[PDB]
Amino acid sequence: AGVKAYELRTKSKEQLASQLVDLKKELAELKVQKLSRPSLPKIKTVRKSIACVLTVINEQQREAVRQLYKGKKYQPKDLRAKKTRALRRALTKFEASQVTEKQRKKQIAFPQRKYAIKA
Amino acid sequence: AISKNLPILKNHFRKHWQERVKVHFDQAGKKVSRRNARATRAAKIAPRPLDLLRPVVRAPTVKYNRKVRAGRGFTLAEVKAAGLTAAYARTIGIAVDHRRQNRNQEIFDANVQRLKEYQSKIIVFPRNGKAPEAEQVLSAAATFP
Amino acid sequence: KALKVRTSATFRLPKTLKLARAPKYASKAVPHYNRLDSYKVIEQPITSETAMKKVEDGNILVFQVSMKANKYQIKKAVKELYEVDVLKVNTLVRPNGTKKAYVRLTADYDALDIANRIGYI
Amino acid sequence: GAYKYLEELQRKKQSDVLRFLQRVRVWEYRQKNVIHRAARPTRPDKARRLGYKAKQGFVIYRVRVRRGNRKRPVPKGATYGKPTNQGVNELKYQRSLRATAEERVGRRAANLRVLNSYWVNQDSTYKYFEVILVDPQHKAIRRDARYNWICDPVHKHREARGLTATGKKSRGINKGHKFNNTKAGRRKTWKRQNTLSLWRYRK
Amino acid sequence: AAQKSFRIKQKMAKAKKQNRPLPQWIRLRTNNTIRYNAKRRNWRRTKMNI
RNA sequence: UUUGUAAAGUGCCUUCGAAGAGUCGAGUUGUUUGGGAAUGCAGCUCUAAGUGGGUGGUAAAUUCCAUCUAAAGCUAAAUAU
RNA sequence: UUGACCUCAAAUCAGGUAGGAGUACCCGCUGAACUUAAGCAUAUCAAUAAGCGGAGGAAAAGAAACCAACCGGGAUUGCCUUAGUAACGGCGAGUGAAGCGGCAAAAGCUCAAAUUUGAAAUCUGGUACCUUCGGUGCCCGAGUUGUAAUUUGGAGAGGGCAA
């Protein structure tokens, strides 16, 4: 079975730390027992458990940082968007929707009138 | 090489001409593609016709000037003598060729009459709305042949 | 209007203020945890009959230690895990690429009475 | 305004004022590096009609190019072929020197985009140019749409595909009966008229 | 050789751990075509060239 | 929300009407073109003009005509894969 | 003596960006020879393969210093035809386009050059706030060796008049 993620997202950092230290002792006391018997599948379902804890701690340490750079400019490069290199390049929707004021006057003065050839 | 009784044949195949053979298997296929284009654009254009008007215009050099042909656009004189301005003609759906000049009277009168028959046979929706949907004719060149 | 005296005949870069760093944001979001801690330093003990002979006779624990560790981090990880003092450490690299640490305890501690406490015997 | 007077002064280059200024500036530019930054354009009329809006994010480089023909490689002057293709000295390099200057200052400043370039000076050994590079990710250029088209990713290295003011000249691109072999670009209008067009129903 | 750098010995470690026959249980597995190990590198036949 | 005594367009008269140079063009040389007394590019050398200039596919002068504006720049779809 | 200006630097200064891969198609440079001429030195292969520089989902080209010489056409591209033609070529071997015409697709425009001078009206960065691909205030900075508004060849500007 192992630990579950929603049960770890309620606990604080101090409880997750001791939860991780107990499971890393569990790995040692199962890797000692692995050699004195022919098989031991149970070690799989303890090391996955450590993976789960090492997810949640990291997750709880990332989103907290996401709330201390909230709204302002210049958040770190692993917190801003990835998307691809070529979209993090050239013009955003504002900087490509910008048009000079003469051509704004010409867009307001003569727009494309919706017509129909019937009669 | 040269042989029995046969014309001199000129065949320009001393190159690597098999690198550059382009066979058109996609022909009927691409036709379907273009027709879907003329479907898809004909959904976007808010029921305006696909093509703009082209003017009656008189062909070039001695072989071809017996015929008459759909030109590029109306001049800045034919448009002005139709009653409407140039940029407003662009927005109405009248294509305007700014650089051609009129030195003939029958072609000028035919283009001005063509603009009158166009401007009388359209209805232009208001800028605001209420949009009486008028069931587009897809072709404007076939309507005014 | 008055000229500075120059006793040297060589002009060099003026001593300028090399300013420190103060970024607008951190280098990475979360400072990474301890990559190589005492749980990851020692991995398994070794239960070959030669290693068990050294345990029962020469007062030496025989561990399999991770390839990144050094004799400093092993001399600290045994004290952190087993609470036992540690003399000279001797780490070879096995020919299958996993490091082996012969950790010799002091005379105060028996290697068998810690070897059955950790379990392998 | 004062740019018609600079235009008409710069059109008279063998007068006494412009040959004195030529000599002083050719010495001054020869004392510096090959590719080096110019703090300010030396021909503001001629920089300005090529596109130098003097504000933040516009950069002038000044660059020497080594003058003369293109001597071929192929060591000790032997070409190992027909005596047609056997000359080594008098070969003449299909691009201009102004294109070499633009490509070099677009390789040094590699974040920047070259807009145009113009001639400033020459001696017997070198020609000296000023290239008018635009920084495309500065925020004074990425908006105000008279210049945000240089921000586009299709305009990377205009100077090394032949798209500057001397690129399209030295590619032979213009309209005309005179420019028939190269009007849509030479090699596309080569490949489209050595293509064997074969249909489904053979015409 | 008899006094080595580390990188070559690391590749010898991999060349040791690959120098073994098939596990005996794979030959019972469903949809199996692997009947032996076709990459047994001996030292008297094939030099691995580091 | 009514963004606004702002913007835009249309008609008549008067004074104007700024327009890109070591660049156009030319000599020679190499290369290329179907381009033929020099089609395009390029090296050097000479170097303009203003009712000007370029082109009008046999060099040249003389007198006209025609047709567009160079030496700065952006741009979908048809197209190739 | 202190303060500006200009030019040039230094910083693990604040924030950015470039390289490398893939390369079917594209944009350029550079560039052979086998071969064909029943030999071969121009030619031809071929403005090709190889090499190199640069992009994109298309690229390029593009709103005529064009074609024409007609009752004139109208940016570019591509297809069918012109056309194996006019022309080049030891006028040999061979090479070899373009205008017109029918069609597909059609979308046009922007700076420089004119004192806004009863008012740089323009732009960047930092800081604070927020309805945070951005908006507002304040503060430095760029910039008048000139950023905005008006105009761009087809028009257009300054005035005057009536809608």
PDB file of N, CA, C and O (backbone and C1' of nucleotides) in Angstrom, chain F residues 38-71:
ATOM      1  P     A F  38      26.715  45.922 -76.264  1.00  0.00           P
ATOM      2  O5'   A F  38      26.288  44.948 -75.086  1.00  0.00           O
ATOM      3  C5'   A F  38      26.652  43.576 -75.090  1.00  0.00           C
ATOM      4  C4'   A F  38      27.335  43.233 -73.802  1.00  0.00           C
ATOM      5  C3'   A F  38      26.942  44.148 -72.651  1.00  0.00           C
ATOM      6  O3'   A F  38      25.805  43.686 -71.933  1.00  0.00           O
ATOM      7  C1'   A F  38      29.293  44.181 -72.918  1.00  0.00           C
ATOM      8  P     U F  39      24.338  44.270 -72.258  1.00  0.00           P
ATOM      9  O5'   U F  39      23.382  43.580 -71.200  1.00  0.00           O
ATOM     10  C5'   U F  39      21.979  43.570 -71.404  1.00  0.00           C
ATOM     11  C4'   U F  39      21.296  42.637 -70.439  1.00  0.00           C
ATOM     12  C3'   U F  39      21.783  42.716 -69.002  1.00  0.00           C
ATOM     13  O3'   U F  39      21.231  43.786 -68.266  1.00  0.00           O
ATOM     14  C1'   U F  39      21.750  40.472 -69.667  1.00  0.00           C
ATOM     15  P     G F  40      22.137  44.565 -67.201  1.00  0.00           P
ATOM     16  O5'   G F  40      22.269  43.535 -66.010  1.00  0.00           O
ATOM     17  C5'   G F  40      21.127  43.180 -65.261  1.00  0.00           C
ATOM     18  C4'   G F  40      21.431  42.079 -64.288  1.00  0.00           C
ATOM     19  C3'   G F  40      22.527  42.361 -63.288  1.00  0.00           C
ATOM     20  O3'   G F  40      22.119  43.197 -62.223  1.00  0.00           O
ATOM     21  C1'   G F  40      22.836  40.219 -64.186  1.00  0.00           C
ATOM     22  P     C F  41      23.166  44.197 -61.539  1.00  0.00           P
ATOM     23  O5'   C F  41      24.178  43.241 -60.780  1.00  0.00           O
ATOM     24  C5'   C F  41      23.760  42.503 -59.646  1.00  0.00           C
ATOM     25  C4'   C F  41      24.785  41.477 -59.245  1.00  0.00           C
ATOM     26  C3'   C F  41      26.107  42.022 -58.745  1.00  0.00           C
ATOM     27  O3'   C F  41      26.083  42.501 -57.419  1.00  0.00           O
ATOM     28  C1'   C F  41      26.531  40.323 -60.296  1.00  0.00           C
ATOM     29  P     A F  42      26.762  43.906 -57.068  1.00  0.00           P
ATOM     30  O5'   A F  42      28.308  43.582 -57.030  1.00  0.00           O
ATOM     31  C5'   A F  42      28.809  42.556 -56.199  1.00  0.00           C
ATOM     32  C4'   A F  42      30.175  42.133 -56.642  1.00  0.00           C
ATOM     33  C3'   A F  42      31.202  43.234 -56.720  1.00  0.00           C
ATOM     34  O3'   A F  42      31.718  43.608 -55.461  1.00  0.00           O
ATOM     35  C1'   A F  42      31.329  41.928 -58.660  1.00  0.00           C
ATOM     36  P     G F  43      32.275  45.090 -55.239  1.00  0.00           P
ATOM     37  O5'   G F  43      33.738  45.023 -55.856  1.00  0.00           O
ATOM     38  C5'   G F  43      34.696  44.125 -55.324  1.00  0.00           C
ATOM     39  C4'   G F  43      35.995  44.150 -56.082  1.00  0.00           C
ATOM     40  C3'   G F  43      36.537  45.511 -56.451  1.00  0.00           C
ATOM     41  O3'   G F  43      37.190  46.160 -55.379  1.00  0.00           O
ATOM     42  C1'   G F  43      36.688  44.079 -58.308  1.00  0.00           C
ATOM     43  P     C F  44      36.809  47.672 -55.023  1.00  0.00           P
ATOM     44  O5'   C F  44      37.831  48.543 -55.871  1.00  0.00           O
ATOM     45  C5'   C F  44      39.223  48.298 -55.815  1.00  0.00           C
ATOM     46  C4'   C F  44      39.888  48.631 -57.126  1.00  0.00           C
ATOM     47  C3'   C F  44      39.775  50.072 -57.599  1.00  0.00           C
ATOM     48  O3'   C F  44      40.771  50.906 -57.043  1.00  0.00           O
ATOM     49  C1'   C F  44      39.258  48.596 -59.374  1.00  0.00           C
ATOM     50  P     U F  45      40.475  52.456 -56.746  1.00  0.00           P
ATOM     51  O5'   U F  45      40.296  53.125 -58.172  1.00  0.00           O
ATOM     52  C5'   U F  45      41.396  53.353 -59.033  1.00  0.00           C
ATOM     53  C4'   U F  45      40.928  53.865 -60.367  1.00  0.00           C
ATOM     54  C3'   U F  45      40.016  55.069 -60.320  1.00  0.00           C
ATOM     55  O3'   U F  45      40.694  56.285 -60.077  1.00  0.00           O
ATOM     56  C1'   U F  45      39.140  53.484 -61.824  1.00  0.00           C
ATOM     57  P     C F  46      39.972  57.442 -59.235  1.00  0.00           P
ATOM     58  O5'   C F  46      38.904  58.017 -60.253  1.00  0.00           O
ATOM     59  C5'   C F  46      39.334  58.677 -61.430  1.00  0.00           C
ATOM     60  C4'   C F  46      38.180  58.989 -62.342  1.00  0.00           C
ATOM     61  C3'   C F  46      37.041  59.772 -61.735  1.00  0.00           C
ATOM     62  O3'   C F  46      37.316  61.148 -61.595  1.00  0.00           O
ATOM     63  C1'   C F  46      36.182  58.027 -63.060  1.00  0.00           C
ATOM     64  P     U F  47      36.743  61.937 -60.325  1.00  0.00           P
ATOM     65  O5'   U F  47      35.163  61.794 -60.454  1.00  0.00           O
ATOM     66  C5'   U F  47      34.439  62.545 -61.412  1.00  0.00           C
ATOM     67  C4'   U F  47      33.024  62.046 -61.555  1.00  0.00           C
ATOM     68  C3'   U F  47      32.100  62.321 -60.391  1.00  0.00           C
ATOM     69  O3'   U F  47      31.619  63.649 -60.382  1.00  0.00           O
ATOM     70  C1'   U F  47      31.835  60.089 -61.090  1.00  0.00           C
ATOM     71  P     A F  48      31.267  64.370 -58.994  1.00  0.00           P
ATOM     72  O5'   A F  48      29.834  64.970 -59.277  1.00  0.00           O
ATOM     73  C5'   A F  48      28.751  64.092 -59.477  1.00  0.00           C
ATOM     74  C4'   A F  48      28.189  64.202 -60.864  1.00  0.00           C
ATOM     75  C3'   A F  48      26.874  64.954 -60.963  1.00  0.00           C
ATOM     76  O3'   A F  48      27.060  66.347 -61.119  1.00  0.00           O
ATOM     77  C1'   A F  48      26.644  62.857 -61.995  1.00  0.00           C
ATOM     78  P     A F  49      26.131  67.374 -60.315  1.00  0.00           P
ATOM     79  O5'   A F  49      24.720  67.258 -61.038  1.00  0.00           O
ATOM     80  C5'   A F  49      24.560  67.620 -62.400  1.00  0.00           C
ATOM     81  C4'   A F  49      23.256  67.107 -62.952  1.00  0.00           C
ATOM     82  C3'   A F  49      22.009  67.644 -62.284  1.00  0.00           C
ATOM     83  O3'   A F  49      21.649  68.925 -62.761  1.00  0.00           O
ATOM     84  C1'   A F  49      21.834  65.305 -62.487  1.00  0.00           C
ATOM     85  P     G F  50      21.928  70.227 -61.865  1.00  0.00           P
ATOM     86  O5'   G F  50      20.519  70.948 -61.800  1.00  0.00           O
ATOM     87  C5'   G F  50      19.725  71.065 -62.963  1.00  0.00           C
ATOM     88  C4'   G F  50      18.555  70.124 -62.912  1.00  0.00           C
ATOM     89  C3'   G F  50      17.251  70.693 -62.371  1.00  0.00           C
ATOM     90  O3'   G F  50      16.511  71.230 -63.456  1.00  0.00           O
ATOM     91  C1'   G F  50      17.646  68.423 -61.664  1.00  0.00           C
ATOM     92  P     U F  51      15.158  72.072 -63.280  1.00  0.00           P
ATOM     93  O5'   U F  51      14.045  71.070 -63.811  1.00  0.00           O
ATOM     94  C5'   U F  51      14.252  70.334 -65.006  1.00  0.00           C
ATOM     95  C4'   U F  51      12.977  69.691 -65.471  1.00  0.00           C
ATOM     96  C3'   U F  51      12.943  69.325 -66.948  1.00  0.00           C
ATOM     97  O3'   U F  51      13.446  68.021 -67.184  1.00  0.00           O
ATOM     98  C1'   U F  51      11.030  70.613 -66.395  1.00  0.00           C
ATOM     99  P     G F  52      14.643  67.769 -68.225  1.00  0.00           P
ATOM    100  O5'   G F  52      15.722  66.954 -67.389  1.00  0.00           O
ATOM    101  C5'   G F  52      16.584  67.619 -66.482  1.00  0.00           C
ATOM    102  C4'   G F  52      16.961  66.739 -65.317  1.00  0.00           C
ATOM    103  C3'   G F  52      17.283  65.294 -65.636  1.00  0.00           C
ATOM    104  O3'   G F  52      18.590  65.123 -66.159  1.00  0.00           O
ATOM    105  C1'   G F  52      15.911  65.408 -63.710  1.00  0.00           C
ATOM    106  P     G F  53      18.889  63.971 -67.238  1.00  0.00           P
ATOM    107  O5'   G F  53      18.562  62.622 -66.468  1.00  0.00           O
ATOM    108  C5'   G F  53      19.453  62.116 -65.491  1.00  0.00           C
ATOM    109  C4'   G F  53      18.858  60.952 -64.744  1.00  0.00           C
ATOM    110  C3'   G F  53      18.563  59.713 -65.561  1.00  0.00           C
ATOM    111  O3'   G F  53      19.724  58.950 -65.819  1.00  0.00           O
ATOM    112  C1'   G F  53      16.742  60.160 -64.149  1.00  0.00           C
ATOM    113  P     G F  54      19.959  58.290 -67.259  1.00  0.00           P
ATOM    114  O5'   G F  54      19.360  56.834 -67.103  1.00  0.00           O
ATOM    115  C5'   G F  54      19.569  56.089 -65.918  1.00  0.00           C
ATOM    116  C4'   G F  54      18.499  55.048 -65.748  1.00  0.00           C
ATOM    117  C3'   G F  54      18.119  54.301 -67.007  1.00  0.00           C
ATOM    118  O3'   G F  54      19.016  53.258 -67.328  1.00  0.00           O
ATOM    119  C1'   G F  54      16.170  54.977 -65.869  1.00  0.00           C
ATOM    120  P     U F  55      19.319  52.920 -68.863  1.00  0.00           P
ATOM    121  O5'   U F  55      18.010  52.156 -69.337  1.00  0.00           O
ATOM    122  C5'   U F  55      17.664  50.906 -68.767  1.00  0.00           C
ATOM    123  C4'   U F  55      16.245  50.523 -69.085  1.00  0.00           C
ATOM    124  C3'   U F  55      15.910  50.391 -70.556  1.00  0.00           C
ATOM    125  O3'   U F  55      16.337  49.177 -71.131  1.00  0.00           O
ATOM    126  C1'   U F  55      14.249  51.666 -69.515  1.00  0.00           C
ATOM    127  P     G F  56      16.846  49.165 -72.646  1.00  0.00           P
ATOM    128  O5'   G F  56      15.549  49.543 -73.486  1.00  0.00           O
ATOM    129  C5'   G F  56      14.467  48.633 -73.597  1.00  0.00           C
ATOM    130  C4'   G F  56      13.361  49.168 -74.471  1.00  0.00           C
ATOM    131  C3'   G F  56      13.745  49.613 -75.869  1.00  0.00           C
ATOM    132  O3'   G F  56      13.968  48.520 -76.751  1.00  0.00           O
ATOM    133  C1'   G F  56      12.274  51.183 -74.922  1.00  0.00           C
ATOM    134  P     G F  57      14.879  48.677 -78.068  1.00  0.00           P
ATOM    135  O5'   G F  57      16.297  48.095 -77.650  1.00  0.00           O
ATOM    136  C5'   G F  57      16.461  47.331 -76.469  1.00  0.00           C
ATOM    137  C4'   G F  57      17.254  46.076 -76.702  1.00  0.00           C
ATOM    138  C3'   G F  57      17.027  45.388 -78.045  1.00  0.00           C
ATOM    139  O3'   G F  57      18.120  45.653 -78.913  1.00  0.00           O
ATOM    140  C1'   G F  57      16.980  43.830 -76.212  1.00  0.00           C
ATOM    141  P     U F  58      17.943  46.249 -80.390  1.00  0.00           P
ATOM    142  O5'   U F  58      19.441  46.425 -80.883  1.00  0.00           O
ATOM    143  C5'   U F  58      20.511  46.447 -79.955  1.00  0.00           C
ATOM    144  C4'   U F  58      21.840  46.336 -80.656  1.00  0.00           C
ATOM    145  C3'   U F  58      22.426  47.641 -81.183  1.00  0.00           C
ATOM    146  O3'   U F  58      23.353  48.188 -80.262  1.00  0.00           O
ATOM    147  C1'   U F  58      22.642  45.846 -82.780  1.00  0.00           C
ATOM    148  P     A F  59      22.930  49.241 -79.134  1.00  0.00           P
ATOM    149  O5'   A F  59      24.251  50.103 -78.928  1.00  0.00           O
ATOM    150  C5'   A F  59      25.375  49.567 -78.247  1.00  0.00           C
ATOM    151  C4'   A F  59      26.660  50.165 -78.756  1.00  0.00           C
ATOM    152  C3'   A F  59      26.647  51.673 -78.943  1.00  0.00           C
ATOM    153  O3'   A F  59      26.980  52.373 -77.760  1.00  0.00           O
ATOM    154  C1'   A F  59      27.408  50.652 -80.920  1.00  0.00           C
ATOM    155  P     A F  60      26.221  53.733 -77.375  1.00  0.00           P
ATOM    156  O5'   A F  60      26.578  54.719 -78.567  1.00  0.00           O
ATOM    157  C5'   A F  60      27.868  55.293 -78.662  1.00  0.00           C
ATOM    158  C4'   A F  60      27.999  56.147 -79.894  1.00  0.00           C
ATOM    159  C3'   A F  60      27.036  57.308 -80.012  1.00  0.00           C
ATOM    160  O3'   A F  60      27.436  58.420 -79.238  1.00  0.00           O
ATOM    161  C1'   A F  60      27.162  56.176 -82.071  1.00  0.00           C
ATOM    162  P     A F  61      26.404  59.124 -78.236  1.00  0.00           P
ATOM    163  O5'   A F  61      26.037  60.482 -78.973  1.00  0.00           O
ATOM    164  C5'   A F  61      27.056  61.362 -79.411  1.00  0.00           C
ATOM    165  C4'   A F  61      26.695  62.031 -80.712  1.00  0.00           C
ATOM    166  C3'   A F  61      25.443  62.887 -80.708  1.00  0.00           C
ATOM    167  O3'   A F  61      25.699  64.181 -80.207  1.00  0.00           O
ATOM    168  C1'   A F  61      25.477  61.514 -82.628  1.00  0.00           C
ATOM    169  P     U F  62      24.559  65.015 -79.455  1.00  0.00           P
ATOM    170  O5'   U F  62      23.448  65.270 -80.556  1.00  0.00           O
ATOM    171  C5'   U F  62      23.609  66.311 -81.500  1.00  0.00           C
ATOM    172  C4'   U F  62      22.481  66.325 -82.493  1.00  0.00           C
ATOM    173  C3'   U F  62      21.088  66.475 -81.917  1.00  0.00           C
ATOM    174  O3'   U F  62      20.766  67.798 -81.530  1.00  0.00           O
ATOM    175  C1'   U F  62      21.089  64.774 -83.552  1.00  0.00           C
ATOM    176  P     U F  63      19.796  68.045 -80.274  1.00  0.00           P
ATOM    177  O5'   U F  63      18.346  67.744 -80.853  1.00  0.00           O
ATOM    178  C5'   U F  63      17.829  68.514 -81.926  1.00  0.00           C
ATOM    179  C4'   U F  63      16.546  67.936 -82.462  1.00  0.00           C
ATOM    180  C3'   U F  63      15.480  67.612 -81.437  1.00  0.00           C
ATOM    181  O3'   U F  63      14.777  68.752 -80.985  1.00  0.00           O
ATOM    182  C1'   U F  63      15.656  65.842 -82.995  1.00  0.00           C
ATOM    183  P     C F  64      14.018  68.709 -79.574  1.00  0.00           P
ATOM    184  O5'   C F  64      12.621  68.041 -79.926  1.00  0.00           O
ATOM    185  C5'   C F  64      12.126  66.962 -79.155  1.00  0.00           C
ATOM    186  C4'   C F  64      11.157  66.128 -79.944  1.00  0.00           C
ATOM    187  C3'   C F  64      10.241  65.241 -79.124  1.00  0.00           C
ATOM    188  O3'   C F  64       9.135  65.930 -78.574  1.00  0.00           O
ATOM    189  C1'   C F  64      11.170  63.978 -80.879  1.00  0.00           C
ATOM    190  P     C F  65       8.608  65.550 -77.106  1.00  0.00           P
ATOM    191  O5'   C F  65       8.027  64.081 -77.273  1.00  0.00           O
ATOM    192  C5'   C F  65       6.850  63.854 -78.029  1.00  0.00           C
ATOM    193  C4'   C F  65       6.658  62.391 -78.318  1.00  0.00           C
ATOM    194  C3'   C F  65       6.276  61.530 -77.132  1.00  0.00           C
ATOM    195  O3'   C F  65       4.901  61.608 -76.807  1.00  0.00           O
ATOM    196  C1'   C F  65       7.999  60.473 -78.343  1.00  0.00           C
ATOM    197  P     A F  66       4.441  61.629 -75.271  1.00  0.00           P
ATOM    198  O5'   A F  66       4.506  60.104 -74.835  1.00  0.00           O
ATOM    199  C5'   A F  66       3.807  59.114 -75.568  1.00  0.00           C
ATOM    200  C4'   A F  66       4.359  57.737 -75.306  1.00  0.00           C
ATOM    201  C3'   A F  66       4.376  57.285 -73.864  1.00  0.00           C
ATOM    202  O3'   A F  66       3.108  56.839 -73.425  1.00  0.00           O
ATOM    203  C1'   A F  66       6.423  56.727 -74.896  1.00  0.00           C
ATOM    204  P     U F  67       2.523  57.305 -72.006  1.00  0.00           P
ATOM    205  O5'   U F  67       3.161  56.270 -70.993  1.00  0.00           O
ATOM    206  C5'   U F  67       3.166  54.887 -71.291  1.00  0.00           C
ATOM    207  C4'   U F  67       4.268  54.189 -70.549  1.00  0.00           C
ATOM    208  C3'   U F  67       4.347  54.519 -69.081  1.00  0.00           C
ATOM    209  O3'   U F  67       3.392  53.795 -68.338  1.00  0.00           O
ATOM    210  C1'   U F  67       6.510  54.584 -70.035  1.00  0.00           C
ATOM    211  P     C F  68       2.869  54.364 -66.942  1.00  0.00           P
ATOM    212  O5'   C F  68       3.638  53.471 -65.884  1.00  0.00           O
ATOM    213  C5'   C F  68       4.064  54.023 -64.658  1.00  0.00           C
ATOM    214  C4'   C F  68       5.464  53.598 -64.310  1.00  0.00           C
ATOM    215  C3'   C F  68       6.048  54.288 -63.098  1.00  0.00           C
ATOM    216  O3'   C F  68       5.616  53.688 -61.896  1.00  0.00           O
ATOM    217  C1'   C F  68       7.622  54.330 -64.862  1.00  0.00           C
ATOM    218  P     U F  69       5.770  54.472 -60.516  1.00  0.00           P
ATOM    219  O5'   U F  69       7.120  53.883 -59.941  1.00  0.00           O
ATOM    220  C5'   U F  69       7.746  54.487 -58.835  1.00  0.00           C
ATOM    221  C4'   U F  69       9.181  54.797 -59.144  1.00  0.00           C
ATOM    222  C3'   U F  69       9.848  55.789 -58.214  1.00  0.00           C
ATOM    223  O3'   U F  69      10.239  55.116 -57.016  1.00  0.00           O
ATOM    224  C1'   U F  69      10.373  56.269 -60.495  1.00  0.00           C
ATOM    225  P     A F  70      11.418  55.575 -56.025  1.00  0.00           P
ATOM    226  O5'   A F  70      12.688  54.828 -56.622  1.00  0.00           O
ATOM    227  C5'   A F  70      12.688  53.414 -56.782  1.00  0.00           C
ATOM    228  C4'   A F  70      13.986  52.923 -57.372  1.00  0.00           C
ATOM    229  C3'   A F  70      15.190  53.003 -56.453  1.00  0.00           C
ATOM    230  O3'   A F  70      15.286  51.864 -55.621  1.00  0.00           O
ATOM    231  C1'   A F  70      15.735  53.899 -58.578  1.00  0.00           C
ATOM    232  P     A F  71      15.333  52.032 -54.032  1.00  0.00           P
ATOM    233  O5'   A F  71      16.859  52.369 -53.736  1.00  0.00           O
ATOM    234  C5'   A F  71      17.884  51.471 -54.129  1.00  0.00           C
ATOM    235  C4'   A F  71      19.205  52.168 -54.309  1.00  0.00           C
ATOM    236  C3'   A F  71      19.676  53.002 -53.137  1.00  0.00           C
ATOM    237  O3'   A F  71      20.278  52.212 -52.127  1.00  0.00           O
ATOM    238  C1'   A F  71      19.962  54.218 -55.146  1.00  0.00           C
TER     239        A F  71
END
